[PDB]
Amino acid sequence: LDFDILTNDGTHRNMKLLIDLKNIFSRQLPKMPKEYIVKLVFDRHHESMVILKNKQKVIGGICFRQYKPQRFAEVAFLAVTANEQVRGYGTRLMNKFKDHMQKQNIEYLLTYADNFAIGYFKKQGFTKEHRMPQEKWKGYIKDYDGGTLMECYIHPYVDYGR
Amino acid sequence: KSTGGKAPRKQ
Ligand SMILES: CC(C)(COP(=O)(O)OP(=O)(O)OC[C@H]1O[C@@H](n2cnc3c(N)ncnc32)[C@H](O)[C@@H]1OP(=O)(O)O)[C@@H](O)C(=O)NCCC(=O)NCCS
Numbered sequence: 256l257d258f259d260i261l262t263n264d265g266t267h268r269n270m271k272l273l274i275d276l277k278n279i280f281s282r283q284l285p286k287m288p289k290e291y292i293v294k295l296v297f298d299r300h301h302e303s304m305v306i307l308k309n310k311q312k313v314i315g316g317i318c319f320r321q322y323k324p325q326r327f328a329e330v331a332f333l334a335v336t337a338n339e340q341v342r343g344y345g346t347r348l349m350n351k352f353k354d355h356m357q358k359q360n361i362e363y364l365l366t367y368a369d370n371f372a373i374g375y376f377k378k379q380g381f382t383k384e385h386r387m388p389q390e391k392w393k394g395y396i397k398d399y400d401g402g403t404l405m406e407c408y409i410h411p412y413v414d415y416g417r
Numbered sequence: 418k419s420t421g422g423k424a425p426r427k428q
Contacts, residue, residue, distance in 0.1 A: 283425075284425055286424055286425070287422055291422065292422060295419060300419065320419050329419055330421075330423050331419060331421065331422045332422045367423050367424070369425065369427075370425070370427035370428065371427055371428040372423065396419070396421070397418060397419070397420045397421070399420070402421065402424075
């Protein structure tokens with residue numbers, strides 16, 4: 256059970272892993288246009304950390320986009336394949352993700368949430384109240400009135416993950 | 418631009 260950064264380098268191996276992950280995302284996020292998931296997942300700004308089982312099978316992952324200069328990242332998609340849910344994989348992925356972001360010198364994680372997802376992210380350390388200056392993401396992250404923008408502060412020396 | 422595909426139904 257590895258949590259690796261999946262690079263989109265145009266190779267058969269990684270492309271197959273990204274597609275498998277994109278398919279997990281669509282199946283688990285039905286309200287999302289499948290072609291939209293494909294666009295972000297393979298674009299020049301996004302990255303994916305996957306949960307690899309037996310170093311070959313993808314069972315989940317998280318797609319994100321770093322805004323390095325500003326020191327914050329946005330979570331695009333997060334999911335675990337149905338038959339592997341409720342086994343703690345998703346929580347371990349998020350902890351691994353926070354650790355990696357800490358090492359990438361990222362100070363804040365931002366994510367839009369709706370309905371259940373709001374409560375889900377609160378348990379993962381995200382809050383509705385932001386401590387990060389609004390004008391920092393404004394102009395970089397689209398501002399939708401219909402969603403709840405949540406943020407997780409990543410302290411330079413708090414130990415995330417296990 | 419990205420948006421925030423982090424969009425799950427209600428569950
Ligand atoms: C969110 C998600 C990644 C969690 O991954 P996971 O491997 O199941 O996570 P964990 O096992 O650490 O989750 C533990 C908690 O999640 C709940 N959970 C996990 N899968 C669930 C499902 N399908 N339905 C309802 N609750 C679920 C568990 O019941 C548990 O609740 P608790 O902490 O009060 O006991 C997974 O449910 C998923 O892929 N969901 C659909 C995608 C989605 O909505 N993503 C967020 C928006 S992009």
